[PDB]
Design a protein around this ligand. Structure first.
Ligand SMILES: NC(=O)c1ccc[n+]([C@@H]2O[C@H](COP(=O)([O-])OP(=O)(O)OC[C@H]3O[C@@H](n4cnc5c(N)ncnc54)[C@H](O)[C@@H]3O)[C@@H](O)[C@H]2O)c1
Ligand SMILES: NC(=O)c1ccc[n+]([C@@H]2O[C@H](COP(=O)([O-])OP(=O)(O)OC[C@H]3O[C@@H](n4cnc5c(N)ncnc54)[C@H](O)[C@@H]3O)[C@@H](O)[C@H]2O)c1
Ligand SMILES: NC(=O)c1ccc[n+]([C@@H]2O[C@H](COP(=O)([O-])OP(=O)(O)OC[C@H]3O[C@@H](n4cnc5c(N)ncnc54)[C@H](O)[C@@H]3O)[C@@H](O)[C@H]2O)c1
Lengths: 334, 335, 335, 335
């Protein structure tokens, strides 16, 4: 049994906890601490009530310094410097770093200085990171000597399972991705200063093109694809749920019907759970609270000669959060 | 001066009228008639005030059975049937069908019976019309013989100019399109009956995949790309402005900087005014009320081997409405 | 046991069905028919998936001209003239009229012509209807003879339970209401023709003021407040859930604590189930899928001298829909 | 001619700068400097483009240590300590203090030490400020000796002109306001930590109640109303524009007709420019970019006995920014 701490009890921080309980505690861990900026009442409140995901099924409360979820008691800290955190005393095996501010191995290591054994960055890591994992694809690579890994991005986790079966059973020369993405909290309501002049613009009124390493990053979860994929994102005005739209050059001739079939039985077999399959006439909100990393949408496949276009829907919060649990385990028992 | 009317006075209707006045009436034209069925107080108010395009910078009022727009008297009508409108009494050279309900050719020639010498449809027409035109790309294929033509879709109007100089100087084996598109009035506010099951879902809260013929219909304006382009739309929660995202296989080797150069040149050349060129870090709302049919975005270009991704922004209402005016001219003045 | 048909299977129609199944079919009725504009395939799809309320918890399938929900077979019709429609064949006890087009005894009686024995309008009716009902407050006025009734509006069902206990224990001279109301399907996505000049404007970008009879109507269900209340609505950019903001002159001195204590007592007693009570720091979306007709928000209470301001949240779809079932059971079993 | 510096170039700063230029530089001042910690290029871009207010109708560019707007060159500084700023070297008569973190006379006086003669806070001030001003209402109170003043808040600037005529000519016992307010950048996109638990909730999907001291603050500028008004805000999903909804007990009997005449008279004389008057059937976005502090809406007035409800629209950004210019002038010229 593994002992976990969450640093950053925000969209990904909390939804990892919510997914831990909504699953039924199958994952052989315990969440023992939780770090954010606010008091325990604040965290208790945001755990019980959510816009995107509704009210939390079970029972939540506070006990002075402790958040209590379905009987389990969880300490609530509010120290912004992770170096001075009591991870040693709590005897934490894995700190989930979900604040967005410590994404390099340099910065994330504060948790090792604090006294935690390992750390999972809820995001793409710095070049210096021990590893970058997309669970269900390359989680094998993990060794006990890995102390500071990355869990990739929500996009990367969606793209990897879409492309692997099509590269294996058809072959891809080159591919270009557009992901159309729900807005996130790094964006703004009405135009204000931001490091990126596009993310400086109102997220609720525009399509905002934005950079993302997701396509290239797949390159180094499936090394055989290294340097063969690029892409970018368009943020649109929705609260949650994204889609990946991949165009690629097939090595040989193919058809829509066949592309779909490869993806179908990929979802029914070796990628089951991770990769979903859809033929129904659904829209983005129908995948809200779907725990798949990637739900491929057969209804949108289009093939024109050697050029193939495929799409997959992903709950960028819920999909990614369920994988944070999976990858926490894998990392602890390497 | 070409004497012009409009039938259907909806978003396309009103914005075509507004387009004309906002330009400075620099089109050799005069809008002499408007044939919605809702009353005149209501249409004046919707001309004056608009959420997406803001307040009309001009004077709007009603004098009985008439509309006054910066001094000019627009005859309001109310006939359901196009065969018996007065048109030819008032010398109507070109009519504009913007309700849609009457899209095909035999229904459309009813305006000719009513007196009109020509007719422009503000939508894709049935496979049986004198032309489908994308102004600045193929409008030169017009003649005096032609009567009931099509001005295409907003999306086809954005795709054609995007693709031409790329096919012409690089060559395009095949392409697939996704247009990320603002919601429109056929959609719904909260899930309720619709003949399409995706469009029956709240427009304000989802990305909604929808079918569009606009990629195939590039064939009809650029014959050399018959069968080479396909695609669809994803409807998103914006009130206006849309982007065409195009992936295509190039016949030869290339770069992003070259694709960009070719497009800049084409924006300063034949398609000047119709096709724009952006290098600035802008978002969709920046292209709201931009009269271009297509503004290519050099910042978004990606080339990976022989696969090329280019994208162009379009105000799905405004650009198209400014082309309708361009088209109505070129229609009349062909032989 | 009473046999019910839903006419108009939209926001209130489907959610009345959904409500009926999510409450474990405790109501002594069976839903035997749905009438709308599409086929069973469309009605089943919209029953199964929803933006505002998420995925239906049970099982929905299709079998020919029958929609099947949790094993119950429900016949799907698509005729937009109630006169026709086989209510006699199906032996319907109560039609729930939820299309928005038959909101008077005269108009809604077309269902009687079609074979049904009694009708509930899902909205304010004319003065001509036999009763206007807010369940929890005046349903005891229902009589065996009454054939066509009105269930009032969402707003009236929220306001009556708010105002009643305060007028009984404190006293109310006059009162004025504003309801900040989610948009509904009678509004538009981008500016376009409508009988109402403000509702002709995008629901997604504006606060839009509109009329409501709810204040006066609280007189009809609580005669002691005849002519004392007035008010209106402001439609805002949200997909569901609304609030009533009532201001009134108290007839004696009171405090915020007393006002809250009174309402807490009423929610716990005679109006239990119809009226909830909140003192948590919540926002509109937290009341989504709350079946109460009115959830008093004690945290928002304001008294200054004799002027009192109180607020109650309501799920305009879910509250009203649960009440439609309750009122059906009261209507048929009356006497 | 007054030399004005802007400390803190967020939305308030930028919008104030734009209103100056968009009004044709009619105000007898010049903007000679801006102090902000962001980099110039970003601040230039955000001056040129805005979602809520659209594209600045002039030219904006950067040239070294200078922001350039319609030919005028504006020195850009980036120092967090205003004691060390060159205001005295620059001859700055009035700093507009727009940062948030200098709302006390004690703190603001750092600008005095830096060389500025006067400071106007774009926000309610601490107890120690020389005055609080709603332009058109109490700017007469400004005196030579005042060096650090408040311009109050956007809501107070809406409410004071609304209630002043009514109190003068009818009389107000007490009053309670709800202000239905656009969201601001102090809120969140999707639920996340905030010091207030309601603002921790998505602004884009809910009605969100929040405290404001803006009703009680009307006592600062209309001492006759001191202690008589209170209220709160409901934040709704719109990017800009808000409405003040005031309920009050009148001291004598009046009519809706009398209330409106009183406001029209006020708008055409004493408060001309600051208070507008609408009888048109308009919605919130039609007031976007309206520079009035308060536009009273005659169509919304209700009276029932001695209870009056009156509503006024305000662009909670543009109104306030225009008034900052007005007040800056009066402050520098005081006595
Ligand atoms: N939201 C998504 O779709 C998504 C998906 C995959 C990965 N991610 C990644 O996860 C990370 C966080 O994303 P998010 O959406 O949860 O952001 P968020 O803003 O919603 O949550 C971040 C939380 O961390 C807290 N925090 C900030 N500084 C802190 C500090 N110094 N110490 C402790 N806590 C601090 C904040 O108060 C907040 O509660 C980012 O790196 C992001 O790229 C996001
Ligand atoms: N809006 C766009 O982005 C755009 C772009 C390209 C093509 N189009 C096409 O243009 C057409 C119109 O679209 P819109 O957005 O303007 O529609 P709209 O719903 O916003 O406006 C249509 C108007 O026509 C009126 N109308 C309906 N039936 C009528 C009838 N029987 N007789 C007279 N008037 C009638 C309505 O009252 C309304 O005022 C559509 O068919 C669409 O496919 C629209
Ligand atoms: N939405 C609310 O919050 C709310 C609350 C209380 C009461 N109501 C009232 O209930 C009624 C329904 O409102 P709604 O929100 O469900 O509207 P809606 O548009 O969602 O529903 C109308 C339904 O009726 C169908 N329809 C239209 N014409 C028909 C015909 N003649 N025959 C059969 N079906 C037809 C439509 O396809 C649709 O499914 C209205 O009178 C409304 O005022 C609405």
């Amino acid at each position: 049994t593994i002992r976990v701490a969450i640093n950053g009890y925000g969209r990904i921080g909390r939804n990892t906890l919510r997914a831990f309980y909504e699953n039924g505690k199958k994952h052989d861990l315990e969440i023992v601490a939780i770090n954010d900026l606010g008091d325990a009442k604040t965290n208790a409140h945001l755990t019980q009530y959510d816009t995107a995901h509704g009210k939390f099924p079970g029972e939540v409360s506070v006990d002075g310094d402790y958040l209590v979820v379905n009987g389990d008691r969880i300490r609530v800290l509010a120290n912004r410097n992770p170096a001075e955190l009591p991870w040693g005393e709590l005897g934490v095996d894995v700190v989930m770093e979900c604040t967005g501010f410590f994404t390099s191995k340099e910065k994330a290591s504060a948790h090792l200085k604090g006294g935690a054994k390992k750390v999972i960055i809820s995001a793409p890591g710095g070049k210096d990171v021990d590893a970058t994992i997309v669970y269900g694809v390359n989680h094998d690579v993990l060794k006990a000597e890995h102390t500071v890994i990355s869990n990739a991005s929500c996009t990367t986790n969606c793209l990897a399972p879409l492309v692997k079966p099509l590269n294996d059973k058809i072959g891809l020369e080159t591919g270009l991705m557009t992901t159309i993405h729900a807005y996130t909290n790094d964006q703004v309501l009405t135009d204000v200063y931001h490091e990126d002049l596009r993310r400086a613009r109102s997220a609720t009124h525009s399509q905002i093109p934005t950079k993302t390493g997701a396509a290239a990053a797949v390159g180094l979860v499936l090394p055989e694809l290294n340097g063969k994929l690029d892409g970018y994102a368009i943020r649109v005005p929705t609260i949650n749920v994204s889609i990946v739209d991949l165009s690629f050059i097939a090595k040989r001739d193919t058809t829509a019907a066949e592309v779909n079939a490869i993806m179908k039985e990929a979802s029914e077999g070796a990628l089951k759970g991770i990769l979903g399959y859809n033929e129904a006439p659904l829209v983005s909100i129908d995948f809200n609270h779907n725990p798949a990393s990637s739900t491929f949408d057969a209804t949108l496949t289009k093939v024109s000669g050697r050029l193939v276009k495929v799409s997959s829907w992903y709950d960028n919060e819920w999909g990614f959060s369920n994988r944070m649990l999976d990858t926490a385990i894998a990392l602890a028992n390497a």
